[PDB]
Design a protein around this ligand. Structure first.
Ligand code: HEM
Length: 399
């Protein structure tokens, strides 16, 4: 049984192990850091199965849950939020914050999203270019999702820049454990303040909604509200940043498609669709423990055994996506759902918001800067460590 998680084949590539497993051992056992075993599911059909089976659980206090790291096991001790709940608890809490993320609400947020992107682009533009190349991540990829989620949560405008930086420290590779923990606790303390403030004087934001609709009524307590807000913040911000950076790098890697996108920004949604399939920046979230014996393919997963369903592998499943390793924004999509945002009940609550942010970025970026170019050789891009989800740390660009 090989050690898992695997390491990416290279900067922009997924672990090489998946393709081989999909072809000769679709459901196999892998070894976790603590020596425990878990079943790794690699085929699309099987990942969908794992994502929806009611015989499987997300509760981390269940023996057999596939924790992939030491900190993961320790974090499982805290009171859980809907991300780690099974029905009916899951939807009971998730539904408390769903409203802001529906396709309709996101559609209505479009002008705000566009406005946020335009402003950041305009700033990045005045950030000059005569003084050398600028870092697209620090100047654009990072603040776009950060400002949007912070603003949606209820953070005032003047606090955005500082909080964006602090939340970034939480996951920065350069950050020490101490710095990361401090930023983490700092954000939690700040949200606790906002919750106290919004309880007294609610505004038009998620935190306020939690306070008035759930805290005051006594459905949840203040700390719960804080944890739900924190979850919405940290769950996908880092991923958003990486996806934006990865999209820019990918376009540079395929001049033909960049030319096509420049000539037709209306192709942004298709490009984002292909981007979320090709670069599965969140590939270790579909994990479960078997509540009872379950058969998957030619394997029997016994009660209390853990399962890791790789949506990254599923998105490269040759049986579903033709020429899966080819990035093609003009790709002819099959009826099967790409799994960049998961599947089933737990499917990313912000899938629509995330795609809207990406679509806005890629339909505006090259209209603002038609000659935007990565300022270093593509093969020199600074990707995240290979033992981590795919992403880019920094990306110098000129325009
Ligand atoms: C483009 C970036 C994003 C990608 C690719 C992504 C992908 C995912 C994936 C694969 C999952 C696991 C779904 C499952 O269990 O099947 C997930 C869950 C989740 N994501 Fe994201 N996500 C993104 C952005 C966001 C953003 C912007 C937020 C916050 C505003 C967010 C909040 C969450 C939450 C709270 C969950 C847990 C949902 C649940 O368990 O019910 N995600 N995301």
């Amino acid at each position: 049984a090989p050690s898992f998680p695997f390491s990416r084949a290279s900067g922009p590539e997924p672990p090489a192990e998946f393709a081989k497993l999909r072809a000769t051992n679709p459901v196999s056992q892998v070894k976790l850091f603590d020596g425990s075993l878990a079943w790794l599911v690699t085929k699309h059909k099987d990942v969908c199965f794992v994502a929806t089976s009611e015989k499987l659980s997300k509760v981390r206090t269940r023996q057999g849950f596939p924790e992939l790291s030491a900190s993961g096991k320790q974090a499982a001790k805290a009171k859980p939020t809907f991300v780690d709940m099974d029905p009916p608890e899951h939807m009971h809490q998730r539904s408390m914050v769903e409203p802001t993320f529906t396709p309709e609400a996101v559609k209505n947020l479009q002008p705000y999203i566009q406005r946020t992107v335009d402003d950041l682009l305009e700033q990045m533009k005045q950030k000059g270019c005569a003084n050398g190349p600028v870092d697209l991540v620090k100047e654009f990829a990072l603040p776009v999702p950060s400002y949007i989620i912070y603003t949606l949560l209820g953070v005032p405008f003047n606090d955005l820049e500082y909080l964006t930086q602090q939340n970034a420290i939480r996951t920065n590779g350069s950050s020490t454990a101490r710095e990361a923990s401090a930023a983490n606790q700092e954000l939690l303390d700040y949200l606790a303040i906002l919750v106290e403030q919004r309880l007294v004087e609610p505004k038009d934001d998620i935190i306020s909604k939690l306070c008035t609709e759930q805290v005051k009524p006594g459905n949840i307590d203040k700390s719960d509200a804080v944890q739900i807000a924190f979850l919405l913040l940290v769950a996908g911000n880092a991923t958003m940043v990486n996806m934006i950076a990865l999209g820019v790098a990918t376009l540079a890697q395929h001049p033909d498609q960049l030319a096509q996108l420049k000539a037709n920004p209306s192709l942004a949604p298709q490009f984002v669709e292909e981007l979320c399939r090709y670069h599965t920046a969140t590939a270790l979230a579909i994990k479960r423990t078997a509540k009872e014996d379950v058969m998957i393919g030619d394997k029997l997963v016994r009660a209390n055994e853990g399962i890791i369903a790789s949506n990254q592998s599923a998105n490269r499943d040759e049986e579903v996506f033709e020429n899966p390793d080819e990035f093609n924004m003009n790709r002819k999509w099959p009826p099967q759902d790409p799994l960049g945002f998961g599947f089933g009940d737990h499917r990313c609550i912000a899938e629509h918001l995330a795609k809207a942010e990406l679509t806005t970025v890629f339909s505006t970026l090259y209209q603002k800067f038609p000659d935007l170019k990565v300022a270093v050789p593509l093969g020199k891009i600074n990707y995240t460590p290979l033992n981590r989800d795919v992403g880019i740390v920094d990306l110098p660009v000129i325009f």
